[PDB]
Amino acid sequence: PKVALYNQNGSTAGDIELNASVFGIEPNESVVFDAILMQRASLRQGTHKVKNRSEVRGGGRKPWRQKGTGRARQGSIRSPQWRGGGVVFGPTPRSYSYKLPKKVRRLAIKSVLSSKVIDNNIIVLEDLTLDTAKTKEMAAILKGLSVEKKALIVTADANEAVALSARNIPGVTVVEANGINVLDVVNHEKLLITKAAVEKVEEVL
Amino acid sequence: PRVKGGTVTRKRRKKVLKLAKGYFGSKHTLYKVANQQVMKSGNYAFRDRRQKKRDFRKLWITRINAAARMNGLSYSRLMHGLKLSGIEVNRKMLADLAVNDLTAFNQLADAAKAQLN
Amino acid sequence: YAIIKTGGKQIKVEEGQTVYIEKLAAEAGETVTFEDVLFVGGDNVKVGNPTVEGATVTAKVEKQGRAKKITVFRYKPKKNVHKKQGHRQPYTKVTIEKINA
Amino acid sequence: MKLHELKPSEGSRKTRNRVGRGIGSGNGKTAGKGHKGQNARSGGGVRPG
Amino acid sequence: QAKAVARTVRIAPRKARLVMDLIRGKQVGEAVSILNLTPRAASPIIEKVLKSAIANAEHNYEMDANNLVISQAFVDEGPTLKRFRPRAMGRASQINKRTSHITIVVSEK
RNA sequence: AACAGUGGUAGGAGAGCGUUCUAAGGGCUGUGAAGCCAGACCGGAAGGACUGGUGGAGCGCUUAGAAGUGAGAAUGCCGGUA
RNA sequence: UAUCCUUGGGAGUCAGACUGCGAGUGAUAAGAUCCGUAGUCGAAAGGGAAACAGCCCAGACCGCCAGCUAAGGUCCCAAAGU
RNA sequence: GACCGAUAGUGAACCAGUACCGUGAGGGAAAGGUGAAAAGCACCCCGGAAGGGGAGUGAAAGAGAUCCUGAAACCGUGUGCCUACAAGUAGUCAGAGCCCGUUAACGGGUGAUGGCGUGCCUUUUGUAGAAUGAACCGGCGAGUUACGAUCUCGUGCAAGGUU
C-alpha cells in the first residue's frame, strides 16, 4: 500500500500510503471467480424464442385416419418429428442474472484491487488535468507513462473532457470513481487512478 | 444456441465403413449392416483369440502322437515316461520342433522309454 | 540351437537369428542373458530340469517394443451391453550371439 | 489472476446428467426410469399423498 | 485420342447399354457398320455421336480413318424425368423417364 | 512397494470424450483455412493428429461459461435412389 | 472372518421360469397350478450332454503359437489307452 | 442479441398465402448461391437440332446457366487376386499360393483349404425365432425452462444472515 506517485509527464513524486483494509487484503480466488461469473452472466440479455408446437401456424386437422391405412399413426402436420417444424424444449426468453451479498461483492472488489496492488500494475496519477479533448496529447502521456497493453482510468471530476478523448481507443475506457466493477478491473490489466478517487473509493469501502 | 449435426456423423460412420473393407456386397458399403457385422467380428475375434491356443495345442499333440507312434510308443506313455524321467520342462511346441529335428526327438524318446522300466 | 524358457513359454533359439519376445527389464542397447537353459542341441547335452553350468545364452536386446493394436470388442446381444478396449502388448527385439553349452 | 486462467473452487461445480443419450453413460433406452410403469410415462406422477 | 459425349439424350441407359456394349474394343470402320445394321432404339443415336467422334479429326489434331479403334466407351445416366401415370382405384402410380450420357473415347492403333 | 480385486439387465455413483456459440491469452491462414476424398499413425474409450489430392476463404489451441450437444431402430418425417 | 447398525440423498422391482427335496389340488397325470427349502437362469459367456436358459463342471480386466486340471472322455469322424 | 444461417429461422429470404386441393368454410406447399467484372463462349468441325469436340475469356470451362463445395445410397468402365463337386448370418482365426510395396512395421491386397460360429433392436420367464420394427442413403427428430421446496457440495458472514 505504498505505491509511488507519478505526474503527468512521467515524473515521480513521494509514495502514497494506501488503505490496508482495502488494498492489502489477501484476495479470495473463489470469490473473485464468482463475482466475475456474476456480472459476466448479467451483461448478456438472452433474447431468443423459438416456436413451440402449439404456435406454428397450422397443424389443426388429423392428416389421415388412425387405422386401415398403411401409414404410421400420426397427429397434426406440425409436429416435432414432422419436417415443417415445432421444436421441443427450445431456448426461451429468460433472465440470466442473480444477486450476491453486499459483503461478498465488497470482499471481491477489495480482493481484486489488492491483487492488482500485489502484482504491481497500479499507477497513481494525481490531479489529471487536460485543457483540451485532443487524443494525441493523452496518447503521448500514456507513452511517457510507459503503458502498452490495455488500461483503465478512473478520474472522477475531470471526466467531462477526458471521456471524449480517451473513448477513441477500443481497448481503453474511462470509468467514474463510483462505477468500479470486476471485469473492467481484471481485463484492463493496468489500473490508472487519481488520488481524489483513491480517497473516494477508500471511504466508499 | 443451436448445435447442428455436423461432420461428426460423417466421421464416425466413415471410420467403421473404412474398417469394414473386404466384406461381401452390401455388408461393405451400407452402415446399417456393416456395423452389425463388426461387433459380430469383434466377438468372433475375441472367441477365436482364445480358441487359437487350444486348436494349436491339438495340432502339436497329434504331431507328437505321430512322432511317438512311429517309434512304437503311445503319446500318453511317452509323456508319463518323460515326467518320471524328470521335470521335462520341454513342452509341446518345442517337442514339435524336435519332430522337425526328428533325430533329437528319437534321442529323447529312447531316454524316456529306457527310463520307463 | 537351444531352448530358453524365457517369459513363461520356451522359444527355440539358434545362433544368429532375431526373436520377438516379451519385454524384459533391460534397456534397449545392453546385452542380456538367459540362465534357465535346456536342450543345447548339436551334441545335444540334455538333462531333466538341466543344471547345464556355463550354458547361459548371451543376447543383445535392441527394441522397447509395443505391438500392433488389437481392438478388443465385447457385446452381449439384445441387452445393450458394450465393452470396447484397445490393447497393445509390449515386447523386446532380441538378437542372439554366443550360444553357450 | 487473469481471465485466461480461470479456476473455480473445486467441488463447487458439477456436470449435468444428460439422461437418455447413448448407453455407455447408463440411463439409455429407458432413460433411467425402468419399464412400463405408470411413473415411467410423461406426466406419470401420482399425487404426493 | 478423341472424345465425344451425348449429355442427356432421352433414352433409357440400359436400353442404350445393350446395343452399346457390342462395339466395345473393335475397329471403328466396321463397328459403325454392325451398329447401323442392327435394329435397336439406341443405334441411330450412338451412330450419330460415334460419327461425331471420328469427325473430331477435321479441325482437330490429326489422325486418319483407318488403323483407328475404340479404346473405351460407356453409357452413363442423366437426370430422370418424373412422370405420374394415372392408375386404377385412383392410385396414381409413378413412372421414371430416364435420360442417359453416352461416352465414346477413340484412339489409334 | 505389498496385498486383494476387476461378468453383468434394471438401476445408483465416479471419471471422462466430442460439437456450436461466448469471453481471456496465445497464433493459423491465398506460400491455400473450413469442408471433402485416400492412406499401412496415436490414445483405454468416446476419439485425435500427420501426409497427399480436391477446395478457394475463414479456423484451431489454452482456461472458463452457456447449451436447440451426440441417432439405428418410433408401420417416425422430408429429399434422393434401388 | 469382517461385515453390522443409525440417518440422509436417489432408484428399479410387485408377469418369473426350470431342476432337486418336502407338501397340497389333480387321476400322488402334465414343460400343470399353488406353497416351503436349495441351486441355476433371470442378470452368466466358457467345457460337457449332437444341436439346448434353467442338467453337470466352472465364473470371462486384457494379451501369450505356456503348463496343470473339473465334468466328460481317450477306434475314427474328433484330442487322448484298439 | 453467449438468436437462425435455407429440412433452420415467419407458411412465406425466391412474384406466398401463390401454385395446388376442396363446391364451400378451409387447408396449404416446394423452390437462395457462375464470375470481381458477362469479360456468358467470336470462329472451325460433326450434326436437323440438341449435344459435343476444338479455338477464346478468366485466377479457374473440372466455372458455361440448379453455375461455390459436391459426401452417401445407386449406377457404369478398365483392371491385381480368386471362382463352374459345391450347399453354410456370409464372419473370425489359422492358412499355402499369387500380386504390390507403407504415416516402415513382428507390411498391404487377394485369398485355395481347415476349425468355430442362427443378424440388430424392442418386449419377454424365455427370441436364431415361424413375435414386433426397419428397402437403402443423407438430413431432422425425444428429460428443458420458469417459480417454489428439499438434500448434498462449495463459498461470505456468522447468533446472526439478508434485502
From the Cβ of A41, is strand F under 7 Å away? yes
Cβ proximity of E81 and E102 under 8 Å:
no
Whether residue D29 lies within 8 A of chain A, CB to CB, comes out as no
Give the count of beta carbons closer than 10 Å to the beta carbon of residue E40. Answer: 15
How far, rounded to the nearest angstrom, does the alpha carbon of residue E14 sit from its chain's CA centroid?
11
Interatomic CA distance for residues E56 and C68, integer angstroms: 56
Longest Cα pair distance anywhere in chain E, in angstroms? 62
Return the DSSP state at B27: G
The one-letter code for the residue type at A8 is: Q
Element containing residue A196 per DSSP (H, E):
helix A195-204
CA to C1' distance (Å), from B24 to G52: 31
- Residue A92 C-alpha cell reads as 426461451
Q: Please identify among residues 93-152 of chain A the ones whose CB lies closer than 8 Å to any CB of chain D.
A: 115
CA to C1' distance (Å), from B45 to G44: 20
Q: Report residues 9-28 of D contacting strand F, contact meaning Cβ closer than 7 Å.
A: 13-18, 21-22, 24-28
Please name every residue paired with A153 in a beta bridge, in sequence order, or none if there are none. A174, A192
Sign of CA dihedral A128, A134, A139, A144: negative
CA-closest candidate to residue B63, choices B116, B113, B105: B105
Does A186 contact D2 at a Cβ distance shorter than 8 Å? yes
Return the DSSP state at A153: E
Interatomic CA distance for residues E75 and E6, integer angstroms: 9
- Residue E17 C-alpha cell reads as 447399354
CA to C1' distance (Å), from C73 to G71: 30
Cβ proximity of A154 and A181 under 8 Å:
no
The one-letter code for the residue type at C64 is: Q
Give the count of beta carbons closer than 10 Å to the beta carbon of residue A151. Answer: 20
Cβ proximity of A122 and A4 under 8 Å:
no
Does C10 contact B42 at a Cβ distance shorter than 8 Å? no
From the Cβ of D8, is strand F under 7 Å away? yes
Residue E39 Cα distances to E30, E43, E74, angstroms: 16, 7, 19
* Mutation choice for D interface testing from A29, A37, A43 by most D CBs within 10 A: A29
How determined? cryo-EM
- β pairing state of C65-66 and C90-96: antiparallel
Please name every residue paired with E5 in a beta bridge, in sequence order, or none if there are none. E103
Touch between chain E and chain D: 3 or more Cβ pairs under 8 Å: no
Phi, psi of E103, deg, nearest 5: -115, 140
Touch between chain E and chain A: 3 or more Cβ pairs under 8 Å: no
Cβ proximity of A163 and A174 under 8 Å:
yes
Residue of B nearest to C51 (CA): B87
Interatomic CA distance for residues E26 and A114, integer angstroms: 92
- Residue A160 C-alpha cell reads as 467531462
Count Cβ–Cβ pairs < 8 Å, chain A vs chain D: 21
**Burial (Cβ within 10 Å: 0-12, 13-18, ≥19) of residue E5:** middle
- Residue C27 C-alpha cell reads as 534397456
Interatomic CA distance for residues B17 and B15, integer angstroms: 6
3-state secondary structure of E68: strand
Q: Which nucleotide is nearest to A95 (CA to C1')?
A: H146
* Residue that has been written with the C-alpha cell 524384459 in this structure: C24
Does D8 contact A32 at a Cβ distance shorter than 8 Å? no
- Residue A114 C-alpha cell reads as 489488492
Give the count of beta carbons closer than 10 Å to the beta carbon of residue A182. Answer: 22
- β pairing state of C31-34 and C72-76: unpaired
Cβ proximity of E12 and E18 under 8 Å:
no
- Residue A131 C-alpha cell reads as 485543457
The one-letter code for the residue type at C82 is: H
- Residue A116 C-alpha cell reads as 492488482
Nucleotides of G under 7 A from a protein CB: 11-14, 43-46, 60-68, 74, 79-82
Q: Report H helices in B1-117.
A: 7-19, 31-69, 75-85, 92-99, 102-116
Give the CB-side neighbour count of residue E91, counting CA atoms within 13 A.
6
Resolution of the determined structure in angstroms stands at 3.6
Interatomic CA distance for residues C49 and B18, integer angstroms: 51
Where does C35-88 show beta strands of DSSP type E? Answer: 37-38, 57-61, 65-66, 72-76, 81-85
What is the side-by-side order of every strand in the sheet holding A151-153?
A12-17, A2-6, A122-125, A191-193, A151-153, A172-174
Q: Report residues 14-43 of B contacting strand F, contact meaning Cβ closer than 7 Å.
A: 14-15, 18, 21, 31-33, 35-36
Does C41 contact B104 at a Cβ distance shorter than 8 Å? yes
